[PDB]
Protein backbone atom coordinates (compact mmCIF):
# COMPACT_ATOMS: atom_id res chain seq x y z
CA UNK A 1 0.00 0.00 0.00
CA UNK A 2 3.09 2.20 -0.55
CA UNK A 3 3.63 2.51 3.21
CA UNK A 4 2.05 2.87 6.70
CA UNK A 5 -1.73 3.25 6.99
CA UNK A 6 -2.89 6.05 9.31
CA UNK A 7 -6.72 6.03 9.27
CA UNK A 8 -9.22 3.43 10.48
CA UNK A 9 -12.68 2.93 9.06
CA UNK A 10 -15.23 2.78 11.86
CA UNK A 11 -16.06 -0.89 11.32
CA UNK A 12 -12.62 -2.41 10.92
CA UNK A 13 -12.16 -1.05 14.44
CA UNK A 14 -11.93 -3.59 17.28
CA UNK A 15 -15.46 -4.62 18.18
CA UNK A 16 -14.83 -4.89 21.91
CA UNK A 17 -14.45 -1.09 22.06
CA UNK A 18 -18.17 -0.95 21.36
CA UNK A 19 -18.23 2.00 19.05
CA UNK A 20 -21.59 2.65 17.41
CA UNK A 21 -22.24 1.94 13.69
CA UNK A 22 -23.11 5.56 12.92
CA UNK A 23 -21.67 8.79 14.47
CA UNK A 24 -19.05 9.03 11.71
CA UNK A 25 -16.80 7.33 9.16
CA UNK A 26 -13.87 6.65 11.42
CA UNK A 27 -12.53 5.08 14.61
CA UNK A 28 -9.55 6.27 16.65
CA UNK A 29 -6.84 3.87 15.40
CA UNK A 30 -4.26 3.22 18.15
CA UNK A 31 -0.87 4.81 18.02
CA UNK A 32 2.23 2.71 17.79
CA UNK A 33 2.90 1.49 21.31
CA UNK A 34 3.10 -1.16 24.08
CA UNK A 35 0.11 -3.18 22.84
CA UNK A 36 -1.01 -4.62 19.52
CA UNK A 37 -3.56 -2.21 18.05
CA UNK A 38 -6.39 -4.74 17.93
CA UNK A 39 -5.71 -5.77 21.56
CA UNK A 40 -5.52 -2.21 22.82
CA UNK A 41 -7.71 0.58 24.09
CA UNK A 42 -7.18 4.17 23.08
CA UNK A 43 -7.24 6.63 25.95
CA UNK A 44 -9.83 8.56 23.95
CA UNK A 45 -12.13 5.57 24.16
CA UNK A 46 -11.61 5.20 27.88
CA UNK A 47 -12.14 8.85 28.82
CA UNK A 48 -15.28 9.45 26.71
CA UNK A 49 -16.74 6.00 25.93
CA UNK A 50 -15.91 3.93 28.99
CA UNK A 51 -15.68 6.77 31.50
CA UNK A 52 -18.10 9.20 29.86
CA UNK A 53 -16.06 12.10 31.26
CA UNK A 54 -15.66 13.63 27.81
CA UNK A 55 -18.18 14.48 25.11
CA UNK A 56 -16.28 15.75 22.08
CA UNK A 57 -13.03 14.33 20.89
CA UNK A 58 -11.59 17.78 21.41
CA UNK A 59 -12.62 17.57 25.05
CA UNK A 60 -10.34 14.54 25.39
CA UNK A 61 -7.15 16.21 24.26
CA UNK A 62 -8.52 18.83 26.61
CA UNK A 63 -8.14 16.38 29.47
CA UNK A 64 -5.01 14.66 28.11
CA UNK A 65 -3.14 17.95 27.54
CA UNK A 66 -3.64 18.66 31.23
CA UNK A 67 -1.68 15.63 32.40
CA UNK A 68 -4.85 14.71 34.33
CA UNK A 69 -4.17 11.09 33.34
CA UNK A 70 -1.12 8.84 33.76
CA UNK A 71 -0.71 5.32 32.37
CA UNK A 72 1.42 2.89 34.39
CA UNK A 73 2.63 5.85 36.41
CA UNK A 74 3.76 8.00 33.50
CA UNK A 75 1.83 10.98 32.17
CA UNK A 76 0.57 10.18 28.70
CA UNK A 77 -0.78 12.95 26.52
CA UNK A 78 -1.43 11.12 23.21
CA UNK A 79 -5.16 11.14 22.30
CA UNK A 80 -4.89 7.57 21.05
CA UNK A 81 -2.25 5.94 23.26
CA UNK A 82 -2.48 2.10 22.91
CA UNK A 83 -3.30 1.36 26.54
CA UNK A 84 -3.90 -2.36 27.01
CA UNK A 85 -3.99 -5.42 29.24
CA UNK A 86 -2.79 -5.24 32.86
CA UNK A 87 -2.33 -1.47 32.51
CA UNK A 88 -3.23 1.02 35.27
CA UNK A 89 -4.33 4.52 34.13
CA UNK A 90 -4.56 6.92 37.05
CA UNK A 91 -6.75 9.99 37.28
CA UNK A 92 -5.15 12.08 40.03
CA UNK A 93 -7.58 15.02 39.86
CA UNK A 94 -10.31 12.63 41.01
CA UNK A 95 -8.33 10.09 43.06
CA UNK A 96 -9.37 7.00 41.11
CA UNK A 97 -7.26 4.24 39.60
CA UNK A 98 -8.20 1.52 37.18
CA UNK A 99 -6.86 -1.65 35.66
CA UNK A 100 -7.47 -2.66 32.07
CA UNK A 101 -8.48 -6.20 32.88
CA UNK A 102 -10.90 -8.04 30.62
CA UNK A 103 -14.65 -8.35 30.98
CA UNK A 104 -16.13 -11.81 30.68
CA UNK A 105 -17.60 -11.10 27.30
CA UNK A 106 -14.25 -9.92 25.99
CA UNK A 107 -14.31 -6.19 26.61
CA UNK A 108 -12.36 -3.79 28.73
CA UNK A 109 -13.92 -3.52 32.16
CA UNK A 110 -13.87 -0.23 34.07
CA UNK A 111 -12.41 -2.24 36.96
CA UNK A 112 -11.48 0.51 39.40
CA UNK A 113 -8.80 -0.46 41.97
CA UNK A 114 -6.95 1.01 44.97
CA UNK A 115 -3.85 3.23 45.21
CA UNK A 116 -2.22 0.15 46.59
CA UNK A 117 -1.89 -2.36 43.71
CA UNK A 118 -1.74 0.61 41.30
CA UNK A 119 1.95 0.59 42.16
CA UNK A 120 2.36 -2.73 40.36
CA UNK A 121 1.05 -4.79 37.47
CA UNK A 122 1.60 -8.23 35.98
CA UNK A 123 3.38 -9.02 32.72
CA UNK A 124 3.55 -12.29 30.79
CA UNK A 125 7.11 -12.86 29.59
CA UNK A 126 7.10 -13.19 25.80
CA UNK A 127 10.78 -13.94 25.31
CA UNK A 128 13.70 -14.32 27.70
CA UNK A 129 17.01 -13.86 25.99
CA UNK A 130 20.73 -13.12 26.32
CA UNK A 131 21.28 -9.51 25.25
CA UNK A 132 24.57 -8.02 24.09
CA UNK A 133 27.53 -7.86 26.51
CA UNK A 134 26.61 -11.18 28.11
CA UNK A 135 23.69 -9.41 29.83
CA UNK A 136 20.38 -11.25 29.94
CA UNK A 137 16.86 -9.80 29.68
CA UNK A 138 13.17 -10.67 29.75
CA UNK A 139 10.57 -9.16 27.45
CA UNK A 140 7.09 -8.89 28.92
CA UNK A 141 3.99 -8.58 26.76
CA UNK A 142 3.55 -4.87 27.37
CA UNK A 143 6.75 -4.03 25.55
CA UNK A 144 8.95 -3.88 28.61
CA UNK A 145 12.48 -5.24 28.60
CA UNK A 146 13.89 -5.92 32.06
CA UNK A 147 17.56 -6.79 32.18
CA UNK A 148 19.07 -9.13 34.80
CA UNK A 149 16.19 -11.39 35.76
CA UNK A 150 15.95 -14.53 37.86
CA UNK A 151 17.47 -17.47 35.94
CA UNK A 152 14.31 -19.34 36.96
CA UNK A 153 11.89 -17.41 34.73
CA UNK A 154 11.22 -19.05 31.39
CA UNK A 155 8.78 -18.05 28.64
CA UNK A 156 5.02 -17.96 29.45
CA UNK A 157 5.83 -17.23 33.09
CA UNK A 158 4.35 -14.01 34.43
CA UNK A 159 6.21 -11.41 36.41
CA UNK A 160 5.28 -8.87 39.07
CA UNK A 161 7.10 -5.75 37.97
CA UNK A 162 6.97 -2.72 40.22
CA UNK A 163 5.63 0.30 38.38
CA UNK A 164 7.70 3.22 39.51
CA UNK A 165 11.06 1.53 39.33
CA UNK A 166 10.92 -1.27 36.78
CA UNK A 167 12.36 -4.27 38.68
CA UNK A 168 10.77 -7.70 38.96
CA UNK A 169 9.39 -8.46 42.42
CA UNK A 170 8.28 -12.10 42.58
CA UNK A 171 7.13 -14.13 39.61
CA UNK A 172 4.84 -17.06 38.82
CA UNK A 173 5.76 -20.06 36.68
CA UNK A 174 3.50 -21.68 34.10
CA UNK A 175 2.67 -25.19 35.28
CA UNK A 176 -0.09 -27.59 36.30
CA UNK A 177 -2.87 -25.78 38.13
CA UNK A 178 -2.23 -22.06 38.34
CA UNK A 179 -4.80 -19.27 38.20
CA UNK A 180 -5.05 -18.28 34.54
CA UNK A 181 -6.49 -15.33 32.66
CA UNK A 182 -7.51 -15.72 29.02
CA UNK A 183 -6.40 -12.69 26.96
CA UNK A 184 -8.09 -13.49 23.67
CA UNK A 185 -9.84 -16.10 21.58
CA UNK A 186 -13.34 -17.43 22.02
CA UNK A 187 -12.79 -17.90 25.74
CA UNK A 188 -11.66 -14.29 26.27
CA UNK A 189 -12.57 -13.01 29.72
CA UNK A 190 -12.53 -16.40 31.43
CA UNK A 191 -10.46 -17.22 34.53
CA UNK A 192 -9.34 -20.48 36.15
CA UNK A 193 -6.85 -23.21 36.96
CA UNK A 194 -5.03 -25.19 34.24
CA UNK A 195 -4.69 -29.05 34.42
CA UNK A 196 -3.06 -29.78 31.08
CA UNK A 197 -0.75 -28.21 28.52
CA UNK A 198 -0.92 -30.15 25.28
CA UNK A 199 2.48 -29.83 23.63
CA UNK A 200 2.60 -29.76 19.83
CA UNK A 201 6.13 -29.72 18.49
CA UNK A 202 5.91 -27.64 15.33
CA UNK A 203 3.32 -25.12 16.47
CA UNK A 204 0.46 -24.12 18.79
CA UNK A 205 0.42 -25.81 22.20
CA UNK A 206 -2.99 -26.03 23.83
CA UNK A 207 -3.96 -25.33 27.41
CA UNK A 208 -6.95 -27.05 28.98
CA UNK A 209 -8.41 -24.72 31.60
CA UNK A 210 -10.66 -25.49 34.58
CA UNK A 211 -12.70 -22.78 36.30
CA UNK A 212 -14.05 -22.62 39.87
CA UNK A 213 -17.40 -23.95 38.65
CA UNK A 214 -15.87 -27.00 36.93
CA UNK A 215 -16.15 -26.03 33.23
CA UNK A 216 -13.21 -27.40 31.23
CA UNK A 217 -12.19 -25.66 27.97
CA UNK A 218 -9.21 -25.16 25.64
CA UNK A 219 -7.18 -22.32 24.14
CA UNK A 220 -3.80 -21.62 22.54
CA UNK A 221 -0.59 -21.19 24.56
CA UNK A 222 -0.29 -17.44 24.02
CA UNK A 223 -3.97 -16.87 24.85
CA UNK A 224 -3.23 -17.97 28.43
CA UNK A 225 -2.02 -15.48 31.09
CA UNK A 226 -1.01 -16.86 34.53
CA UNK A 227 -1.98 -14.65 37.47
CA UNK A 228 -1.55 -16.63 40.68
CA UNK A 229 -2.18 -19.79 42.70
CA UNK A 230 -5.53 -21.62 42.61
CA UNK A 231 -8.27 -19.43 44.06
CA UNK A 232 -5.44 -17.06 45.02
CA UNK A 233 -5.22 -14.19 42.49
CA UNK A 234 -2.21 -11.88 42.43
CA UNK A 235 -4.51 -8.98 41.64
CA UNK A 236 -8.03 -7.67 42.01
CA UNK A 237 -10.54 -9.35 39.69
CA UNK A 238 -13.60 -7.60 38.25
CA UNK A 239 -17.19 -8.49 39.14
CA UNK A 240 -18.33 -11.92 37.99
CA UNK A 241 -14.81 -13.20 38.61
CA UNK A 242 -14.43 -14.25 34.96
CA UNK A 243 -16.81 -17.20 35.17
CA UNK A 244 -18.82 -17.18 31.89
CA UNK A 245 -22.53 -17.79 32.48
CA UNK A 246 -24.87 -19.28 29.85
CA UNK A 247 -27.46 -16.90 28.39
CA UNK A 248 -30.08 -19.07 30.02
CA UNK A 249 -28.48 -18.48 33.42
CA UNK A 250 -27.75 -14.91 32.37
CA UNK A 251 -31.45 -14.23 31.87
CA UNK A 252 -32.30 -15.04 35.49
CA UNK A 253 -29.54 -12.98 37.16
CA UNK A 254 -30.98 -9.87 35.53
CA UNK A 255 -34.76 -10.15 35.78
CA UNK A 256 -34.53 -11.83 39.21
CA UNK A 257 -32.35 -8.99 40.48
CA UNK A 258 -34.99 -6.63 39.15
CA UNK A 259 -37.93 -6.46 41.53
CA UNK A 260 -37.05 -5.18 44.97
Amino acid sequence: ARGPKKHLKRLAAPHHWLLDKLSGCYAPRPSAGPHKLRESLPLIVFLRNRLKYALNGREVKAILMQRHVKVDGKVRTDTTYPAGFMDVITLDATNENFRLVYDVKGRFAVHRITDEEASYKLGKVKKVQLGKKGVPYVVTHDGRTIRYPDPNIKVNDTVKIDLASGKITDFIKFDAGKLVYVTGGRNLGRIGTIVHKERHDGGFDLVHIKDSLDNTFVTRLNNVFVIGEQGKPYISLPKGKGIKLSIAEERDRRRAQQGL
Binding site: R10, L22, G24
Partner: protein, 131 residues
Protein backbone atom coordinates in the same frame (compact mmCIF):
# COMPACT_ATOMS: atom_id res chain seq x y z
CA UNK B 1 -17.71 5.02 3.46
CA UNK B 2 -20.02 5.32 6.45
CA UNK B 3 -22.24 2.50 7.63
CA UNK B 4 -25.61 1.60 6.08
CA UNK B 5 -28.68 2.52 8.12
CA UNK B 6 -30.04 -0.94 7.42
CA UNK B 7 -33.71 -1.49 6.46
CA UNK B 8 -36.43 -4.09 5.79
CA UNK B 9 -39.71 -4.38 3.95
CA UNK B 10 -42.53 -5.09 6.39
CA UNK B 11 -45.08 -6.90 4.22
CA UNK B 12 -45.46 -9.24 1.28
CA UNK B 13 -48.19 -9.50 -1.36
CA UNK B 14 -49.98 -12.79 -2.06
CA UNK B 15 -49.05 -15.12 -4.94
CA UNK B 16 -52.23 -15.63 -6.97
CA UNK B 17 -53.66 -12.11 -7.06
CA UNK B 18 -57.26 -12.78 -7.99
CA UNK B 19 -58.70 -15.35 -5.57
CA UNK B 20 -62.22 -14.10 -4.98
CA UNK B 21 -62.57 -15.95 -1.65
CA UNK B 22 -59.41 -14.28 -0.39
CA UNK B 23 -60.52 -10.86 -1.62
CA UNK B 24 -63.82 -11.32 0.21
CA UNK B 25 -62.02 -12.46 3.38
CA UNK B 26 -59.53 -9.61 3.00
CA UNK B 27 -62.18 -6.92 2.49
CA UNK B 28 -64.01 -8.10 5.58
CA UNK B 29 -61.12 -7.44 7.92
CA UNK B 30 -60.57 -4.01 6.38
CA UNK B 31 -64.03 -2.98 7.46
CA UNK B 32 -64.25 -4.26 11.02
CA UNK B 33 -60.78 -3.17 12.14
CA UNK B 34 -61.05 0.07 10.22
CA UNK B 35 -58.18 -0.53 7.82
CA UNK B 36 -57.11 1.84 5.03
CA UNK B 37 -55.78 -0.67 2.50
CA UNK B 38 -54.72 -4.26 1.92
CA UNK B 39 -51.09 -3.48 2.80
CA UNK B 40 -52.12 -3.22 6.46
CA UNK B 41 -53.39 -6.78 6.22
CA UNK B 42 -50.32 -7.94 4.27
CA UNK B 43 -47.92 -6.47 6.84
CA UNK B 44 -49.57 -8.53 9.54
CA UNK B 45 -49.90 -11.53 7.24
CA UNK B 46 -46.16 -11.36 6.79
CA UNK B 47 -45.56 -10.99 10.55
CA UNK B 48 -47.45 -14.20 11.31
CA UNK B 49 -45.48 -16.19 8.75
CA UNK B 50 -42.14 -15.40 10.37
CA UNK B 51 -43.58 -16.40 13.74
CA UNK B 52 -45.01 -19.67 12.43
CA UNK B 53 -41.74 -20.30 10.58
CA UNK B 54 -39.67 -19.51 13.66
CA UNK B 55 -42.05 -21.66 15.69
CA UNK B 56 -42.25 -24.63 13.35
CA UNK B 57 -38.44 -24.62 13.31
CA UNK B 58 -37.88 -24.92 17.06
CA UNK B 59 -40.41 -27.75 17.15
CA UNK B 60 -38.29 -29.89 14.83
CA UNK B 61 -35.61 -29.69 17.52
CA UNK B 62 -35.64 -32.08 20.47
CA UNK B 63 -36.95 -30.50 23.65
CA UNK B 64 -34.45 -29.67 26.41
CA UNK B 65 -32.70 -27.84 23.54
CA UNK B 66 -31.17 -24.73 25.15
CA UNK B 67 -31.91 -22.80 21.95
CA UNK B 68 -35.46 -24.10 21.58
CA UNK B 69 -36.13 -23.49 25.26
CA UNK B 70 -34.51 -20.05 25.39
CA UNK B 71 -35.72 -18.86 22.00
CA UNK B 72 -39.16 -20.45 22.31
CA UNK B 73 -40.34 -19.24 25.68
CA UNK B 74 -38.93 -15.87 24.62
CA UNK B 75 -41.25 -15.76 21.63
CA UNK B 76 -44.12 -16.92 23.78
CA UNK B 77 -43.21 -14.30 26.38
CA UNK B 78 -43.38 -11.53 23.78
CA UNK B 79 -46.55 -12.86 22.16
CA UNK B 80 -48.36 -12.83 25.50
CA UNK B 81 -47.14 -9.40 26.61
CA UNK B 82 -49.21 -7.95 23.74
CA UNK B 83 -52.29 -10.15 24.02
CA UNK B 84 -51.83 -12.17 20.87
CA UNK B 85 -51.26 -15.40 22.81
CA UNK B 86 -53.63 -16.47 25.63
CA UNK B 87 -52.57 -16.54 29.27
CA UNK B 88 -52.50 -20.32 29.17
CA UNK B 89 -51.88 -21.08 25.55
CA UNK B 90 -48.16 -20.81 26.34
CA UNK B 91 -46.97 -23.70 24.16
CA UNK B 92 -45.24 -23.54 20.77
CA UNK B 93 -47.94 -25.82 19.32
CA UNK B 94 -50.37 -23.06 20.25
CA UNK B 95 -48.51 -20.15 18.68
CA UNK B 96 -48.88 -22.01 15.40
CA UNK B 97 -52.64 -21.68 15.61
CA UNK B 98 -52.39 -17.91 15.87
CA UNK B 99 -54.62 -16.36 13.25
CA UNK B 100 -54.44 -12.88 11.79
CA UNK B 101 -56.98 -11.04 13.94
CA UNK B 102 -55.20 -12.11 17.14
CA UNK B 103 -52.76 -9.36 16.26
CA UNK B 104 -55.42 -7.16 14.66
CA UNK B 105 -57.47 -6.99 17.85
CA UNK B 106 -54.57 -5.62 19.93
CA UNK B 107 -54.44 -2.67 17.51
CA UNK B 108 -54.57 0.67 19.37
CA UNK B 109 -57.08 1.34 16.61
CA UNK B 110 -59.46 -1.34 17.85
CA UNK B 111 -58.68 -0.55 21.48
CA UNK B 112 -59.88 3.04 21.39
CA UNK B 113 -63.02 1.36 20.10
CA UNK B 114 -63.27 -1.59 22.51
CA UNK B 115 -63.00 0.27 25.84
CA UNK B 116 -65.48 3.08 25.12
CA UNK B 117 -63.77 6.24 23.83
CA UNK B 118 -64.93 5.78 20.21
CA UNK B 119 -67.92 3.50 19.53
CA UNK B 120 -66.60 3.13 15.95
CA UNK B 121 -63.36 1.78 14.49
CA UNK B 122 -63.62 4.40 11.72
CA UNK B 123 -64.05 6.91 14.50
CA UNK B 124 -61.22 5.32 16.43
CA UNK B 125 -59.01 5.91 13.37
CA UNK B 126 -59.42 9.69 13.14
CA UNK B 127 -59.47 9.85 16.92
CA UNK B 128 -55.91 8.54 17.05
CA UNK B 129 -54.28 10.30 14.11
CA UNK B 130 -55.85 13.60 15.17
CA UNK B 131 -53.88 13.20 18.43
Amino acid sequence: PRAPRTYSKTYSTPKRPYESSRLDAELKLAGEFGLKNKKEIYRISFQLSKIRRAARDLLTRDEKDPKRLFEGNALIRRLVRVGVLSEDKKKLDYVLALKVEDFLERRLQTQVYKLGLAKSVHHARVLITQR
